[PDB]
Amino acid sequence: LDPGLQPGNFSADEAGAQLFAQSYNSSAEQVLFQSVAASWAHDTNITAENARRQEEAALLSQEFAEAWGQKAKELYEPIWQNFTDPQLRRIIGAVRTLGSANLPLAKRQQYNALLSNMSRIYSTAKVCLPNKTATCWSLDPDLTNILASSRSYAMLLFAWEGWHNAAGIPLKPLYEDFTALSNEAYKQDGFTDTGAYWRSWYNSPTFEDDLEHLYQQLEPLYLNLHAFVRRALHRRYGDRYINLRGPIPAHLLGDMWAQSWENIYDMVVPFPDKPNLDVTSTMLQQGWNATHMFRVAEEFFTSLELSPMPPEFWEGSMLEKPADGREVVCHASAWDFYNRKDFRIKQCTRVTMDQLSTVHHEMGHIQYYLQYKDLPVSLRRGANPGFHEAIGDVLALSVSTPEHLHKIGLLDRVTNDTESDINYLLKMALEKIAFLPFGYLVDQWRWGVFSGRTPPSRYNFDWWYLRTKYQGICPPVTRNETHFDAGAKFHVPNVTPYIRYFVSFVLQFQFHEALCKEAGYEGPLHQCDIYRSTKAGAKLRKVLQAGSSRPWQEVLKDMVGLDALDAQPLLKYFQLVTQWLQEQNQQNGEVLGWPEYQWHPPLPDNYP
Ligand SMILES: *[C@@H]1O[C@H](CO[C@@H]2O[C@@H](C)[C@@H](O)[C@@H](O)[C@@H]2O)[C@@H](O[C@@H]2O[C@H](CO)[C@@H](O[C@@H]3O[C@H](CO[C@H]4O[C@H](CO)[C@@H](O)[C@H](O)[C@@H]4O[C@@H]4O[C@H](CO)[C@@H](O)[C@H](O)[C@H]4NC(C)=O)[C@@H](O)[C@H](O[C@H]4O[C@H](CO)[C@@H](O)[C@H](O)[C@@H]4O)[C@@H]3O)[C@H](O)[C@H]2NC(C)=O)[C@H](O)[C@H]1NC(C)=O
Ligand SMILES: *[C@@H]1O[C@H](CO)[C@@H](O[C@@H]2O[C@H](CO)[C@@H](O[C@@H]3O[C@H](CO[C@H]4O[C@H](CO)[C@@H](O)[C@H](O)[C@@H]4O[C@@H]4O[C@H](CO)[C@@H](O)[C@H](O)[C@H]4NC(C)=O)[C@@H](O)[C@H](O)[C@@H]3O)[C@H](O)[C@H]2NC(C)=O)[C@H](O)[C@H]1NC(C)=O
Ligand SMILES: *[C@@H]1O[C@H](CO)[C@@H](O[C@@H]2O[C@H](CO)[C@@H](O[C@@H]3O[C@H](CO)[C@@H](O)[C@H](O[C@H]4O[C@H](CO)[C@@H](O)[C@H](O)[C@@H]4O)[C@@H]3O)[C@H](O)[C@H]2NC(C)=O)[C@H](O)[C@H]1NC(C)=O
Ligand SMILES: *[C@@H]1O[C@H](CO)[C@@H](O[C@@H]2O[C@H](CO)[C@@H](O[C@@H]3O[C@H](CO)[C@@H](O)[C@H](O)[C@@H]3O)[C@H](O)[C@H]2NC(C)=O)[C@H](O)[C@H]1NC(C)=O
Ligand SMILES: *[C@@H]1O[C@H](CO)[C@@H](O[C@@H]2O[C@H](CO)[C@@H](O[C@@H]3O[C@H](CO)[C@@H](O)[C@H](O)[C@@H]3O)[C@H](O)[C@H]2NC(C)=O)[C@H](O)[C@H]1NC(C)=O
Ligand SMILES: *[C@@H]1O[C@H](CO)[C@@H](O[C@@H]2O[C@H](CO)[C@@H](O[C@@H]3O[C@H](CO)[C@@H](O)[C@H](O)[C@@H]3O)[C@H](O)[C@H]2NC(C)=O)[C@H](O)[C@H]1NC(C)=O
Ligand SMILES: *[C@@H]1O[C@H](CO)[C@@H](O[C@@H]2O[C@H](CO)[C@@H](O)[C@H](O)[C@H]2NC(C)=O)[C@H](O)[C@H]1NC(C)=O
Ligand SMILES: *[C@@H]1O[C@H](CO)[C@@H](O)[C@H](O)[C@H]1NC(C)=O
Ligand SMILES: [Zn+2]
């Protein structure tokens, strides 16, 4: 520990604690920058040298959070709740959280080693065909691509069986040990369990109830969608393997976790005679290039009179693919270095209509970072953890439209045909609405484990209960408590909350509606854009400047006017497809929901 990074002495006063907050701030951006700089380099190009620097940076960060966290508890754990500023209470409350650093070394060293071991066995999971094969598969590319692409039911089944079998089972012992150790650490931090810690972020005493009220508002839309897809699969696979009343076999939905079904959009799409618009042909013809694209993105924000990208951003960012042959993580990401001056993007840009849209949300994050850089570093995070991605997405929504592309000049004429825009809304539904029930059930399920209400003998039973209950899926081959299908997801062994994403996808439209309402727009909400609309920016800026200083429920209210989440706006946005599906289901007599829930298909005749 560098002494300039090691806390001093502070009184039990607020007057002292204000000085503690100030000192933590000044040290914090000096450590966090050094940490993120290393992590930036490692990700900007892989080298074992940079991986080492990455590893050392990780240790240096934890060592810093520890050295301050221990004193924050030692001096202010008896007090912090008392302090007059809700901003300061937020500052100290964040520092005062220690997480795993509560565990004594013996447990601590098991804990880290245990968490890493889960990630290893998941990331390095494998499936092998039932021969003396030279070669096995892995989740990507082999499994993701066979599962999404092929539709011979047996082959599709085996791929799903192998994965949840191989990825889950060897996790089963580890995840229990994690659950115990996880809760024990937070117990000392001040939470009943890890689950009550995660829910602590949304600072809502009624949080879990709020979700069910939201999800109940979605269920008519989701059931409408689910019931529609279910019929389509019946056309394809046969009467033996689908029940027009029952739930859907989990592996037919085109995705290993059935969390988003878009890979059956090719099979289901409405109005097969219409195209789906691709503006790439203009963009290449215009001589657009990656470097230019961001200036369009910046144009948008400047058009809202949000802040332009500072010169440092143009000096630093890796907008284009590198000139070297060096290996790089191409997946697009946006970075804030807690050093106030320089913000950074990595995009690996390929000039296509899709990545044009993608750049806008990635720059959206940068605009978000730019606005709250003025806060003390402890607060420089989204008003709540899903709130940051929402401000990212509302931007991509607007520009994805044909309406905005015409103001960009990339589109020649607007073509207001509902058959086309239904195609667009429906594919987006198969992407994101299918995700809401899944995103909801996981963190109910994990809360079930962390609260203990799912003891280890029920990990798998409570999982499939939650799947059929919410997502309308059932397992393709009988699954029993030796298996552990909850582990087969990325976010479970990586102990990463999904609930942020669900909260975000509701805040997304709850903003978009409140912006388009403010931007003077009227008409079909998916045809709104806010570009050039200074009225939207000035209100949007008020959200971004708040960062996390002000409780999100108060900030959201100041933007939208509602003290809480609501899915009515989301239903407004999807309204056109909502109506269309209701017609199509009514025409087919399709039974919404899934009675005969106690059904799942027989096995293929010679399996395998
Ligand atoms: C990615 O795309 C970027 C943008 O490209 C342009 O725009 C897009 C939409 C497409 O249409 C592209 O095809 C198009 O090229 C590229 O940056 C641009 O690169 C080109 C070529 O390298 C630049 O063109 C050259 O610019 C010189 C400077 O011209 C400006 O400054 C003069 C003073 O020096 C001034 O007198 C001019 O009026 C001009 O001012 C610009 O005005 C327009 C509006 O009228 C603004 O939009 C600009 O921002 C203004 N820029 C400034 C600095 O004020 C010219 O001297 C030069 O002409 C000479 O060279 C050409 C060959 O290049 C000869 O053919 C010609 O005869 C003459 O001798 C030429 O115009 C362009 O300026 C760059 N953009 C900017 C903003 O500077 C990226 O390089 C590209 N990257 C990749 C990898 O593709
Ligand atoms: C969390 O902790 C950070 C870091 O300690 C605090 O930032 C510091 O806050 C104070 C108060 O806002 C700020 O002082 C003001 O800075 C303005 C710019 O001052 C710069 O120029 C003068 C000369 O004109 C220098 O004397 C200063 O040291 C500054 O120097 C420049 O700083 C930038 C930013 O880091 C750096 O990139 C440049 O390299 C450097 N210049 C050169 C030539 O190297 C003044 O206009 C104003 O009057 C005040 O002096 C101080 O500069 C901040 N430092 C940094 C590093 O950001 C945060 O305030 C704190 N958080 C909160 C919420 O308080
Ligand atoms: C990924 O990005 C990083 C940052 O841009 C980049 O880092 C540099 O990589 C090169 C090698 O490709 C390093 O060069 C050598 O590093 C070794 C130690 O690992 C040193 O022994 C070498 O010392 C000589 O060169 C010095 C100047 O670099 C001289 O001052 C010295 O006297 C010796 O003559 C040499 O430094 C370089 O150090 C790193 N730098 C950093 C900051 O990481 C890396 O190259 C990129 N990846 C790829 C594949 O290019
Ligand atoms: C932060 O506050 C602490 C507690 O008020 C200060 O700690 C004290 O620091 C002095 C030196 O400034 C230490 O002196 C040592 O005392 C022992 C005898 O106990 C002697 O053998 C050593 O040679 C040395 O003189 C003292 O131990 C230490 N006491 C405690 C309880 O921490 C500290 O000075 C303050 N920080 C700063 C930067 O001033
Ligand atoms: C994380 O997973 C790894 C791998 O499963 C665990 O490390 C393994 O630990 C065992 C002993 O605990 C090692 O087996 C022993 O090896 C020695 C020779 O080194 C041998 O004499 C013993 O009879 C026994 O076979 C095993 O080699 C070791 N594997 C690796 C790769 O290190 C680790 O304990 C797990 N940690 C947690 C927290 O789960
Ligand atoms: C939960 O369901 C699984 C199947 O999905 C059951 O596991 C399977 O049980 C049978 C009977 O023991 C195993 O067959 C045996 O395999 C061994 C080779 O491993 C072979 O030597 C025997 O002759 C016999 O064929 C089968 O392999 C096994 N599968 C797995 C993946 O373990 C399990 O029994 C069910 N749970 C409970 C509690 O019964
Ligand atoms: C910190 O907590 C204490 C205890 O809840 C508060 O002290 C009490 O304050 C009320 C009026 O605010 C008095 O009627 C009590 O007599 C006080 N009790 C004691 C033991 O002093 C204190 O006000 C809180 N501080 C803040 C800033 O809210
Ligand atoms: C598209 O045409 C319909 C015609 O009924 C109209 O109601 C709708 O508002 C048009 N789109 C926009 C963005 O105005
Ligand atoms: Zn994002």
List keywords for this structure.
mainly alpha, two-stranded parallel ribbon, binds a molecule of 4 linked components (NAG-NAG-BMA-MAN), binds a molecule of 5 linked components (NAG-NAG-BMA-MAN-NAG), binds a molecule of 3 linked components (NAG-NAG-BMA), hydrolase, binds a molecule of 7 linked components (NAG-NAG-BMA-MAN-NAG-MAN-FUC), Angiotensin-converting enzyme, 58% helix
> How many angstroms separate the termini?
59 Å
Range of strand content: under 5%
Walk across the major sheet and give the strand order: 1-4
| Tally of alpha and pi helices | 24
In angstroms, what is the radius of gyration? 25 Å
* Helix/sheet category: mainly alpha
Small molecules (ligands, ions, cofactors) in the structure:
a molecule of 7 linked components (NAG-NAG-BMA-MAN-NAG-MAN-FUC), a molecule of 5 linked components (NAG-NAG-BMA-MAN-NAG), a molecule of 4 linked components (NAG-NAG-BMA-MAN), a molecule of 3 linked components (NAG-NAG-BMA), a molecule of 2 linked components (NAG-NAG), 2-acetamido-2-deoxy-beta-D-glucopyranose, zinc ion
User: Element order, helices and strands?
Assistant: HHHHHHHHHEHHHHEEHHHHHHEHHHHH
Disulfide bonds: 128-136, 330-348, 516-528
Site (Not glycosylated): 494
Subcellular location: Cell membrane; Cytoplasm
Protein name: Angiotensin-converting enzyme
Characterization of the model:
- The chain has 608 residues and is an all-alpha fold.
- The chain has 24 helices and 4 strands.
- A hairpin with a 6-residue loop joins strand 2 and strand 3 (343-346).
- Helix 15 (387-400) crosses helix 20 (499-518) and helix 18 (435-450) crosses helix 20.
- It is globular and about 75 Å long.
- A molecule of 2 linked components (NAG-NAG) binds at residues 82, 84.
